[PDB]
Amino acid sequence: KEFEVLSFEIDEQALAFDVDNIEMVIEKSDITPVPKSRHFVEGVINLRGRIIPVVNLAKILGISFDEQKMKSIIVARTKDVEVGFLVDRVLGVLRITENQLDLTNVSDKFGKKSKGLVKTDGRLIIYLDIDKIIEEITV
Amino acid sequence: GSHMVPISFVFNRFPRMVRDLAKKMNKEVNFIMRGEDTELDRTFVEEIGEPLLHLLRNAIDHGIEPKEERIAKGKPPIGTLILSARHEGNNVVIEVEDDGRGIDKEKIIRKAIEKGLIDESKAATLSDQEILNFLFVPGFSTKEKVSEVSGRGVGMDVVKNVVESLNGSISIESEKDKGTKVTIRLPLTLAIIQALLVKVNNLVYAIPIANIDTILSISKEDIQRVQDRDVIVIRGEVIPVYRLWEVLQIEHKEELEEMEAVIVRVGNRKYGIVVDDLLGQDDIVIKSLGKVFSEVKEFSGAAILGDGSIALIINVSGIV
Numbered sequence: 001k002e003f004e005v006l007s008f009e010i011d012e013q014a015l016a017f018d019v020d021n022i023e024m025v026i027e028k029s030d031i032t033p034v035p036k037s038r039h040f041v042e043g044v045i046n047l048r049g050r051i052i053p054v055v056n057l058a059k060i061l062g063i064s065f066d067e068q069k070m071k072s073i074i075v076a077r078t079k080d081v082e083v084g085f086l087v088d089r090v091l092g093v094l095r096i097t098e099n100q101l102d103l104t105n106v107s108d109k110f111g112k113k114s115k116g117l118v119k120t121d122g123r124l125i126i127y128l129d130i131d132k133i134i135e136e137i138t139v
Numbered sequence: 140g141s142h143m144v145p146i147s148f149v150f151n152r153f154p155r156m157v158r159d160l161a162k163k164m165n166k167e168v169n170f171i172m173r174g175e176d177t178e179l180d181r182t183f184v185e186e187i188g189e190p191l192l193h194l195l196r197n198a199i200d201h202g203i204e205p206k207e208e209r210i211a212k213g214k215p216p217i218g219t220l221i222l223s224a225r226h227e228g229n230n231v232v233i234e235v236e237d238d239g240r241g242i243d244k245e246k247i248i249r250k251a252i253e254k255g256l257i258d259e260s261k262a263a264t265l266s267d268q269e270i271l272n273f274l275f276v277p278g279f280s281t282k283e284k285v286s287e288v289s290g291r292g293v294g295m296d297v298v299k300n301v302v303e304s305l306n307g308s309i310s311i312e313s314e315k316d317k318g319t320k321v322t323i324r325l326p327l328t329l330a331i332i333q334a335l336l337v338k339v340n341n342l343v344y345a346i347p348i349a350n351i352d353t354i355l356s357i358s359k360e361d362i363q364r365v366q367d368r369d370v371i372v373i374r375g376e377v378i379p380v381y382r383l384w385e386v387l388q389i390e391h392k393e394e395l396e397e398m399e400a401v402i403v404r405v406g407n408r409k410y411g412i413v414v415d416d417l418l419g420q421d422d423i424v425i426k427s428l429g430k431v432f433s434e435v436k437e438f439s440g441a442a443i444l445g446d447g448s449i450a451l452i453i454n455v456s457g458i459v
């Protein structure tokens with residue numbers, strides 16, 4: 001009954017995904033834009049010779065948004081899909097657990113997009129559901 | 140078209156990375172590379188790279204056995220790592236071979252069961268190979284994710300993913316105490332198309348030469364607006380033309396004085412794309428851009444220009 005999770009920020013707003021799928025976190029450099037494209041995706045980058053789509057988490061959620069601050073992309077891979085989430089910076093992996101995990105999943109505004117909201121040392125760490133949010137983007 | 144390149148290009152970083160991964164483990168390895176000139180598509184060199192290094196690593200990490208344990212099994216002290224490449228039909232073949240502790244299919248099956256993935260009677264209709272394919276199946280190596288989380292890399296499921304993304308494929312061949320040998324086969328001829336690389340504000344786009352009727356170099360005046368449409372005339376014939384930035388609503392200075400107008404044909408109709416500058420002709424490999432973009436009609440894929448910058452590929456018929 002022990003969680004491990006990758007946690008990051010968005011203009012001081014903490015969140016986290018499950019390291020289960022997190023592939024890696026590259027430092028955002030250049031992001032070639034894809035014209036006339038669903039505005040919640042900032043474009044595509046070249047990762048080790050393959051083309052990866054960099055979606056903007058801050059915008060996909062609808063939160064504190066500012067660009068010259070977001071310097072980290074969280075590449076993740078599902079069964080068939082691969083995406084890069086752009087966020088301000090990643091604090092890193094964290095060891096969370098049942099006791100620490102709280103659940104007022106009816107509390108946060110973004111429905112299923114985010115599982116329960118957990119806290120540690122008095123923090124607003126929202127536990128987002130990757131495999132789900134990504135599926136929200138693909139389909 | 141001479142898109143190929145000798146595999147040396149990827150193989151030379153290795154003889155050294157091998158020599159070092161040995162020290163960081165005290166294993167004595169006689170690394171051999173053979174076929175260090177087998178030409179494979181210009182592309183592969185950047186992707187095929189990490190997977191091979193990974194394989195290369197395993198051998199030295201798990202495969203090759205430490206001196207002692209090695210003399211104990213009556214195997215010369217010095218292990219053997221072999222990186223080879225060759226052509227075998229319509230494919231390029233790259234294999235990483237060693238004579239280490241093997242892969243012991245017997246327990247890989249067990250593990251395969253305890254993870255409720257295979258029935259016990261069913262697991263008999265397997266060939267040593269497929270047994271090993273489990274080695275790929277996601278998280279079939281527990282670990283923890285960490286080393287991978289963001290550190291020194293971990294996982295084959297990817298190595299497979301990669302070679303599979305290259306329309307290729309791979310297999311493992313192993314027997315306990317007789318080393319292992321992974322075999323990657325990539326295609327020898329790709330879906331290469333010829334296109335004119337065209338620019339629009341340091342954004343690069345590509346137009347299949349296979350549709351280009353003729354290219355012209357016009358001025359920001361030759362484009363005359365009728366009622367709505369914008370057209371140009373060439374030795375009579377009026378040819379409708381689209382300003383690429385506007386077609387893609389792209390923040391644009393305004394427009395220089397001089398430009399270029401690519402005139403392409405689709406079925407029975409012809410028109411023209413207006414751009415800032417020509418970049419040149421080239422052979423690119425059309426790579427699709429995820430599902431996060433399926434919807435976008437204007438582009439029929441993307442490509443990785445040599446210098447490593449991406450260039451979206453224009454879909455003649457997809458534009459208005």
Ligand SMILES: Nc1ncnc2c1ncn2[C@@H]1O[C@H](COP(=O)(O)OP(=O)(O)NP(=O)(O)O)[C@@H](O)[C@H]1O
Pocket residue numbers: 197198200201202203237239240241242274280282286292293294295296319
């Ligand atoms: N050449 C080999 N020799 C011996 N064992 C191998 C070889 N290749 C693969 N294996 C075994 O297959 C299992 C995993 O392969 P894979 O998922 O690619 O790597 P890993 O072992 O999980 N990660 P790392 O521990 O960083 O190398 C390993 O844990 C080994 O026990």
